[PDB]
Amino acid sequence: QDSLSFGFPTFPSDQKNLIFQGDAQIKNNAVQLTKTDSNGNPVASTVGRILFSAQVHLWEKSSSRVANFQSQFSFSLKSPLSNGADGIAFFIAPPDTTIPSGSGGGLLGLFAPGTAQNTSANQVIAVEFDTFYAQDSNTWDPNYPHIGIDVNSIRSVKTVKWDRRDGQSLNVLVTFNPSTRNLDVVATYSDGTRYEVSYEVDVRSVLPEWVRVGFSAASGEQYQTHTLESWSFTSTLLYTA
Amino acid sequence: QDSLSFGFPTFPSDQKNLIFQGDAQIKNNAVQLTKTDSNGNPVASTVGRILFSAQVHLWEKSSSRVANFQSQFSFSLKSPLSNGADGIAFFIAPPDTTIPSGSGGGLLGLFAPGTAQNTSANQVIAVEFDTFYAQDSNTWDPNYPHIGIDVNSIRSVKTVKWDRRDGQSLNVLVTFNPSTRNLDVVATYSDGTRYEVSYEVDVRSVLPEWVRVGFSAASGEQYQTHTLESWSFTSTLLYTA
Ligand SMILES: CO[C@H]1O[C@H](CO)[C@@H](O)[C@H](O)[C@H]1O
Ligand SMILES: CO[C@H]1O[C@H](CO)[C@@H](O)[C@H](O)[C@H]1O
Ligand SMILES: [Ca+2]
Ligand SMILES: [Ca+2]
Ligand SMILES: [Mn+2]
Ligand SMILES: [Mn+2]
């Protein structure tokens, strides 16, 4: 299809169009990307992801069209500690994507250790909400919590200082305009605190014509829950000047 | 997802979200449901169907909600014969639906011979555009080309006279309003000729909560092409009093 749209106001237990990978599962109307114990508390060493089953036609060579898309979602992070890790990411990748070996902790379940910073070795675009930046393990991170745009590398091409708020839902709007090629990210807490980051990227040179979209999260030594509460997505192929 | 929509202004041969059954396949940016030879001429004894891969949440028991959906599509039929057969149908059925054995010809690839008219043995809602009505073989049909609403039986719960126009596209809008429980059908030819038929049906008593939507077509001894030219669909779960 030229256009596709779907919306999950909440996540009821009986899902049919979601691909669950790793430790991801539905709990209390929300998707728990990372594993939690019987009490509902976060645990260490866990990676989980979800993808919508239907493939998205991001661009079409024959017609020279590129899709304009928008992904709106909200999530919350909770941890008994104060150094919650490692973060959650909205991502777009080839349809057959699977959790790379050794992609836990700071790699957010998106990159393999040996090629995490090799751009010509990856095919992924992600918007990360990174809460752990210890310079000894996450050497590629700025020294502070941040929202970043990742293009084929765990080392963001652009980041913005961000504030982690335990238990508070962050509302996010990610949009891609094929006309200007700008991928814009706007995130806000209920009190109006806003964060914005954007980057110009030609999706045609990074991803194949058909892709799958979803979320990924992980916790290494440090942990926190990564709760996806809602998600709506829409894409439409358009002709650019 | 509570809501889902997709649009196929045309059908490029590079499809990823369509399930093809039988002889259905993409030809010249359109779906040819029934088999055609090298020159694109229709042949006898062929059945074909397509379904969108993502399952649609028609209704939800736990929340007492039922979906409001709309399906807009256009097709054309062509045959050198004076009695082209057998017809095309938009249908809704359980996710695992496959072409029943012996469902060819007048059964439109939708029903099995043994239970074609047994309502307690089927789970399908379809809007048929039936061009073959020979009273000796299609004993259940009125004696003329017609549009029919089928609920668990090849013997339509309702039909209205329809005119078959060789090689002319028919635009159809099928809608279901959960409030009134009305399934409305409106079809038109490019010259303004209009056909309308409506039927009240509680989809909850006929179909499971999750279903797949698509098209089916067949030709027995008499034949014609059944070309799906475009299709858009949208559904949203709504609270029903
Ligand atoms: C000590 O390092 C480990 O734990 C941290 C914090 O969870 C992760 O960032 C890192 O990738 C993992 O290897
Ligand atoms: C002569 O009968 C055969 O051909 C007609 C026309 O195609 C079909 O309607 C029927 O099901 C099939 O058995
Ligand atoms: Ca990090
Ligand atoms: Ca018939
Ligand atoms: Mn980072
Ligand atoms: Mn009929």
From TrEMBL, chains A, B:
Name of this protein: Lectin
One example of the protein's molecular function in GO is: metal ion binding
Q: Which residues bind Ca(2+) 1?
A: E128, D130, D141, H146
Q: Where does Mn(2+) 2 bind?
A: D130, F132
* Pfam families on file: Lectin_legB (PF00139)
Q: Which family does it belong to?
A: Belongs to the leguminous lectin family.
Residues annotated for Ca(2+) 2 binding in this entry: D130, F132, N138, D141
Q: Where does Mn(2+) 1 bind?
A: E128, D130, D141, H146
Species: Pterocarpus angolensis (Kiaat tree)
Pyrrolidone carboxylic acid sites (modified residues): Q1
Where does the Legume lectin domain start and stop, copy by copy? 3-238
Keyword set, alphabetical order: Calcium, Lectin, Manganese, Metal-binding, Pyrrolidone carboxylic acid
- PROSITE patterns found in the cross-reference section: LECTIN_LEGUME_ALPHA, LECTIN_LEGUME_BETA
- Which residues, renumbered to this chain, are glycosylated? N118
